[PDB]
């Protein structure tokens, strides 16, 4: 029956209800994209991180990464890091400089891949914050195309207004239904984003340490 | 018909409705200015960034920038950066100092052009936050020039109050309509602003690296 | 007529309405003080900043500042900065130290004059945040000295309650009227405060640069 | 009697009420886990911190920690710290480096154990923020399966709607009851988390100081 | 008369009203403790700060502090600072190190006494944020032990419900009355806390400067 009400409403409330059902649908597409992105990230980070803290030397690891054309996440942040370090050593620079250099070009890798994991995470924040109040605008337009209507009729039976009051609440309900899934995913992926940054940041620190020692 | 109601209302609610329709109109002007500013920024950043990471040497690039009187964005941040570096080298200073110097005067370029991209972005935050509650003040004044009125009449027909209740909801609706476009643009341009800062910041880091190597 | 209602209300709602009309009046006094403070700041910053980047040498500028007893803003932050630098050089310290020193005692000038521009800016944040909800407390007390009253009367005519419902809405209206001017000035002066800090901070950086070069 | 209402409601409001009673129950499980985690942390920190600032030398303490397989919190952050310091000294590196090294690998211990104390603290923030508005969605669905119903009946007795209005308010009440215990524990454990970070951070600083002196 | 209503209410609303009157009372106790703590702090800071920038040498000041067993605030932060500096100099360490050392052990004094001024300041933030919504839960329980009641009676006189609607609003009023004094003191003491940190931080910077000069 609810389907019927949405079909037979003021043009304005109907546009609010499309703006919001599209926000709902886009929310859900982003929540699928962000979930895939942050599962690939977590998986490849564990794979590389394991292999790096496995016996095989830095040089060995660097060889493989250079060979792979599918370098992604930590593996690419590592390749870009050591690429700098090897490129400097060849120019017989001081260790102090070599480390400082390699530590700049992998803060310029852990920040240029955070940006590409958090693809839609800001949109979900908007959808989540605005959408409730797009709904509310629909509600107010609805309650205000009752009372504007009520004046005209001979008799103010509650039954006169009520069909119009419903078509208001529908819009605020749709508003809350667009907004809730998108503030339980701007919350869950903002968390997963800080986890992955921290995991990779602490791996970067621990890789630096290795290089300083392997130097002296 | 709605037009009619706004025309025939209490002086106070009418002033709330002008304060808000002007906020709406100014929001929209800022949302056009910010959109132009951040598209020129993104376009010129890609152009320069491409050309810099193209084969041509630093000196070549510096020549062109000095020639151009339309220096804007990264190109001006670069000119001001290297201008410092060339100005120091001529005073036979230590490399360490030369880099530190050039790295200060282009943190004093990526921060004195962020401020000029984000022209109106703070206004949109105000319009977006306050305007809902300017509307609400209109609503309350409206519901309170019903009930104050209701007392006077012989008979409290719902039909008596309803024309006055509408002219309240209109103000809260206009309030939400000023405020929604300006919290979907204090959200979208705050994002585009952090993108452009990060893009230019990471370009600054990568330019520093080049200079350190080209030194030793 | 509205004046009449405020005069003839429950003692509690009347105290809410004084607490709020005083917040309104104090808001407005602070919004005048903050506006004067941040216009003098912006004016003197441009004057000094112009004169400094004018031809005249550091020593010349330092002379004048020492002479003036009305040293304020950048001019005092500069005097305190160079005063350190001159005081060190006389103790034949290393350039490196001289700069580091002068750069500490003018981060201890750009932070001990930010605090004195932002005189009342935190109060406006309170007035702006609380005052809506002081009003709401008045509203609830009002709606709750209707219904508590309604029980007593022989006949529940809407006309019985309505004079009491109004005197509630008045309090929430006054609440919104205290709070709106003080969240469009905790927004506008927080902005002007960050502008002046940034302007003076970037001037401090550019003054440091001069001193480092004038050293070597 | 309340039990009866929840049993006899629209399928949708019933699902809102399960989503929320589960959030309530999970909140409470997390509030128990976080309380155990932060009491063990506070207890072991005091034990170690006491013993460290007790007479016994660093070497003595390091011996014991290496022996213990139950190393947790400060004791493990200390073992990982000194392990670096001892590992460097053996490679006859400069004191300056030894300290810098040991100070990196215990910022990579106070940050990889903060993450494991704050196990569920982010969930409580979600439950606390969303759950009120899941409830509200239930409320609106409820008020909107009254009015949609009201139209149908011959007579609009208040008594007709009221049984349906209740089953709405139940959902917003359950919504507030899920959300309040979880914003008085995302507040209380965010506090206890910053306490434990600060306590351990300041212990790390004071341990560094000891090592620098014991060096020279 | 109001007293009567609170006495004759549903067990649940009565528990909400005790939870909130206790929050009110605890708020007020904390607002007294925080006010004493931050007046002693401000007073002793001015006393010491005056005496330090008075003629008497560092050594003189250090003597007195060592003598006093009532060392508190800046005076203790200073004693702990110089205690480090004197303890290093005796171990004939380089000036550079002596300053760095003394500057670490008084960032580990301005942060271990901020924590002890801000005793209850976080509680006031909770009371202030939650308490409104504890009240609202009481309100909803109240409006929902009207309508659940309304069904039963033969006749739905407004006069039937109204005694029950009041006992709801009382709870939201008490809710706002717990919460307002505690967001005008989590605002006023968060401010006074940042003032005292800044005052002491800038004193620490200015003390460091003295030591560096008195060294060379």
Residue with tokens 């808001």: C27
Give D63 to chain E, closest Cα distance, Å. Answer: 27
CA distance A23 to chain B (A): 13
Tally of residues, chain E? 216
- The runs of H, that is alpha helices, within E8-120 are 11-53, 58-67, 74-89, 95-104
Residues 6+ apart with CB under 8 A from C196: C38, C41, C42, C45, C114, C117
Of the candidates A5, A165, A212, the beta carbon closest to that of D101 is on: A212
| Inter-residue contact D202 to D74 (CB < 8 Å) | no
CB D138 within 8 A of CB D168: yes
DSSP character at residue D70: -
> Among A105, A140, A151, whose Cβ lies nearest the Cβ of B162?
A151
The span from the CA of A196 to the CA of A203, in Å, is: 10
- The answer for residues whose C-beta is within 8 angstroms of residue B181's C-beta and 6 or more apart is B24, B27, B28, B31
Counting beta carbons within 10 angstroms of the beta carbon of residue C149, is it exposed (0 to 12), middle (13 to 18) or buried (19 or more)?
middle
Residues in chain C: 216
Measure the N-to-C terminal CA separation of chain C; round to a whole number of Å: 77
CA of residue A191 relative to chain centroid, distance: 10
Residue D183 is encoded by which pair of tokens? 């914003």
Number of residues in chain A: 216
User: E209 and C100 in contact (C-beta within 8 Å)?
Assistant: no
Nearest Cα neighbor of C136 from C178, C169, C184 is C169
Kindly tell me whether chain A and chain B come into contact, counting contact as 3+ Cβ pairs under 8 Å. yes
Those residues of chain A whose CB sits closer than 8 Å to some CB in chain B are 84, 87-88, 91, 93, 97, 101, 104-105, 107-108, 111-112, 115, 122, 125-126, 129-130, 133-134, 136-137, 140-141, 143-144, 147-148, 150-151, 156
- Crossing angle of helices D11-53 and D74-89, in 10° steps, is 50
Distance (Å, whole) CA B97 – CA B103: 10
**Angstrom distance (rounded) from CA B76 to CA D92:** 48
Tokens of A209: 């340490």
User: What are the start-end ranges of the H helices in E144-187?
Assistant: 147-150, 158-179
Chains C and B touch (3+ CB pairs under 8 A): yes
Nearest C-alpha neighbor of B196 from the set B128, B102, B106, B115? B115
Q: Is the CB of D184 less than 8 angstroms away from the CB of E130?
A: yes
For A132, residues 6+ apart whose C-beta sits below 8 A from its C-beta are: A175, A176, A178, A179, D133
Distance set, CA A166 to CA A162, A171, D140, D141, E30 (Å): 6, 9, 10, 10, 47
- Whether residue E100 contacts residue D213, with contact meaning beta carbons closer than 8 Å, is answered with no
| Cα–Cα distance, E18 to E20 (Å, whole number) | 5
Contacts of E165 in chain C (CB under 8 A): 147
> Which phi and psi angles does A73 have, rounded to 5°?
70, -135
| Cα–Cα distance for residue pair D83/D70, rounded to 1 Å | 17
CB contact under 8 A, A180 and D84: no
Which residue, among B88, B108, B168, would best test binding to C if mutated, counting the most C CBs under 10 Å from its CB? B108
CA dist., res. E63 & res. E82, Å (int): 11
Q: Which of C131, C141, C168 is nearest to B133 (CA)?
A: C131
C-alpha angle with apex C128: C126 to C131, nearest 5 degrees?
Answer: 85
Mutation choice for B interface testing from A148, A158, A193 by most B CBs within 10 A:
A148
d(CA C128, CA C180): 7
Q: Looking at the complex, report in whole angstroms how far the Cα of residue D157 sits from the nearest Cα belonging to chain E.
A: 8
Give C61's contacts (C-beta < 8 A, 6+ positions apart). Answer: C51, C52, C78
Note the Cα E49 to chain centre separation in Å.
23
Residues of chain C positioned with their CB less than 8 A from the CB of E177 = 137
Tokens at E159, concatenated: 């006069």
Q: What region, left, alpha or beta, does residue C188 occupy, with left being phi > 0 and alpha being psi -120 to 50 degrees? A: alpha
Q: How far apart are CA B198 and CA B204, in angstroms?
A: 10
Show which residues on chain C lie within 8 Å of chain B, measured between beta carbons.
Answer: 1-2, 5, 132, 157-159, 162-163, 165-166, 169-170, 172-173, 176-177, 179-180, 183-184, 187-188, 191, 195, 198, 202, 205-206, 208-209, 212-213, 216
- DSSP, res B120: S
Q: Per CB distance under 8 Å, which residues of E are interface residues toward C?
A: 1-2, 5, 132, 157-159, 162-163, 165-166, 169-170, 172-173, 176-177, 179-180, 183-184, 187-188, 191, 195, 198, 202, 205-206, 208-209, 212-213, 216
Q: Which residue from A104, B178, A191, E132 is spatially nearest to D123, judged by alpha carbons?
A: A191
Method: cryo-EM
C partners (3+ CB pairs within 8 A) are B, E
**Buried (b) or exposed (e) across D92-104, using 16+ Cβ within 10 A?**
ebeeebbbebbbb
Dist CA B124 CA B188 (whole Å): 11
Helix axes D11-53, D121-143, angle to 10 degrees: 160
Q: H or E stretch including E6?
A: helix E2-7
Distance separating alpha carbons of residues A50 and A55, to the nearest angstrom = 10
> Are chains A and C in contact at 3+ CB pairs closer than 8 Å?
no
Q: Is B155 exposed, middle or buried (0-12, 13-18, 19+ CB in 10 A)?
A: exposed
Contacts of E182 (CB under 8 A, 6+ apart): E23, E27, E30, E31, E124, E125, E127, E128, E131
User: Across the interface, which of A157, A162, A173 has its CB nearest the CB of D141?
Assistant: A173
Give burial (CB, 10 Å; 0-12/13-18/19+) of C57.
Answer: exposed
Count of CA atoms in the C-beta half-sphere (13 A) of A181: 16
For residue B184, CA distances in Å to A123, A124, A133, B188 come to: 9, 12, 12, 6
Report the distance separating Cα E2 and Cα C148, nearest Å: 9
- E181, E31 Cβ separation under 8 angstroms: yes
C187 CB neighbour count, 10 Å cutoff: 19
Cβ neighbours of residue D126 closer than 8 Å, sequence gap 6 or more: A183, A184, A187, A188
Distance CA B52, CA A10 (A): 56
Distance CA B134, CA B171 (A): 8
Cβ of C205 within 8 Å of Cβ of B108? The answer is yes
Count of Cβ atoms closer than 10 Å to residue D5 Cβ: 17
CB contact under 8 A, E169 and C137: no
Q: What is the DSSP letter of A69?
A: S
- Go through chain A and list every residue after which a break occurs, taking a C to next N gap over 2.5 angstroms, comma-separated: none
Kindly list the distances between the CA atom of residue D125 and the CA atoms of A191, C37, D41, D89, in Å, as whole numbers in the listed order.
11, 40, 21, 45
Alpha-carbon distances of D201 from A103, D195, E121, rounded to whole Å: 23, 10, 22
> Which chain D residues have any C-beta within 8 angstroms of a chain A C-beta?
84, 87-88, 91, 93, 97, 101, 104-105, 107-108, 111-112, 115, 122, 125-126, 129-130, 133-134, 136-137, 140-141, 143-144, 147-148, 150-151, 156
Helix ranges, C90-157 (H): 95-104, 121-143, 147-150
Give buried/exposed letters for E94-112 (b at 16+ CB in 10 A, else e). eeebbbebbbbbbebbbbb
| Partners of residue B112 in chain C, C-beta under 8 Å | 202
Burial B56-80 (b: 16+ CB within 10 A, else e): eebeebbeebeeeeebebbbbbbbb
Which of C124, C133, C202 is the mutation pick for testing B, counting most B CBs within 10 A?
C202
- E47: closest CA among E5, E15, E75? E75
Structural tokens at position D150: 């009201």
Check: CB of residue A78 under 8 Å from CB of residue A207: yes
Locate the chain D residue with the closest alpha carbon to A132: D133
Q: Which among C110, C127, C124 is positioned nearest to C188, based on CA atoms?
A: C124
Question: The tokens of C22 are what?
Answer: 């005083």
- For residue D187, report the phi and psi dihedrals to the nearest 5 degrees: -105, -35
3-state secondary structure (DSSP) of residue C104: helix
Rounded-to-integer distance, Cα C111 and Cα C114, Å:
5
Cβ–Cβ contacts within 10 Å for residue A12, how many? 17
Q: What is the dihedral of CA B109, B115, B116, B118, to 10 degrees?
A: 140
Residue bearing tokens 């190190």 = E97
Chain A residue with minimal CA distance to B180? A130
Q: Give domain limits for chain B.
A: 2-6+55-215
- D126, D115 Cβ separation under 8 angstroms: no
**Distance from C-alpha of C42 to C-alpha of C199, rounded to nearest angstrom:** 9
CB C11 within 8 A of CB C22: no
Q: Using CA coordinates, name the residue in chain C closest to E191.
A: C122
C-alpha–C-alpha distance, residues C198 and C206, integer Å: 12
User: Which chains border A (3 or more CB–CB pairs < 8 Å)?
Assistant: B, D
CA B6 to each of CA A12, B12, B17, B180, D36: distance values in angstroms, whole numbers, following the listed order: 18, 11, 8, 21, 60
**Which residue on chain C is closest to E132 by alpha carbon?**
C133
Residue B213 C-beta-side C-alpha neighbours within 13 Å? 19
> Are D184 and E105 within 8 A, CB to CB?
no
The C-alpha atoms of residue B127 and residue B183 are separated, in whole angstroms, by 8
Report yes or no: D95 and D215 within 8 Å, Cβ to Cβ: yes
Alpha-carbon gap: E208 to the closest alpha carbon of chain C (Å): 10
Q: Which residue has the tokens 């004057």?
A: C47
Q: Is C178 in a helix, a strand, or coil? A: helix
Phi, psi angles (nearest 5°) of residue C105: -80, 0
Structure letter (DSSP) for residue E94: -
Please give, rounded to a whole number of angstroms, the shortest distance from the CA of C206 to a CA of chain E.
Answer: 22
Separation of alpha carbons A34 and A29, rounded Å: 9
Residue B99, judged by CB atoms within 10 A of its CB (0-12, 13-18, 19+), counts as middle
């Amino acid at each position: 029956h609810i389907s019927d009400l949405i079909l037979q409403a003021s043009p304005v409330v109907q546009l609010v209800m499309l703006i919001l059902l599209l926000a709902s649908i886009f929310s859900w597409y982003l929540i699928a994209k962000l979930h895939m992105s942050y599962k690939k990230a977590r998986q490849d980070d564990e794979h590389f991180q394991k292999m790096f803290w496995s016996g095989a030397e830095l040089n060995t690891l660097y060889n493989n990464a250079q060979l792979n054309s599918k370098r992604s996440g930590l593996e690419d942040i590592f390749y870009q890091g050591l690429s700098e370090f090897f490129k400097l050593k060849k120019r017989q620079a001081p260790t102090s400089q070599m480390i400082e250099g390699t530590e700049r070009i992998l803060r310029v890798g852990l920040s240029r891949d955070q940006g590409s994991l958090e693809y839609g995470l800001g949109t979900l924040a908007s959808i989540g914050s605005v959408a409730p109040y797009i709904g509310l605008f629909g509600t107010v337009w609805g309650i205000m195309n009752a009372f504007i209507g009520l004046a005209a009729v001979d008799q103010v039976t509650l039954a006169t207004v009520a069909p119009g009051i419903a078509e208001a609440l529908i819009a605020t309900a749709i508003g809350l239904f667009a907004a809730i899934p998108a503030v339980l995913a701007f919350n869950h992926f903002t968390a997963k984003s800080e986890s992955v940054y921290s995991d990779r940041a602490l791996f970067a620190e621990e890789m630096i340490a290795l290089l300083q020692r392997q130097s002296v």
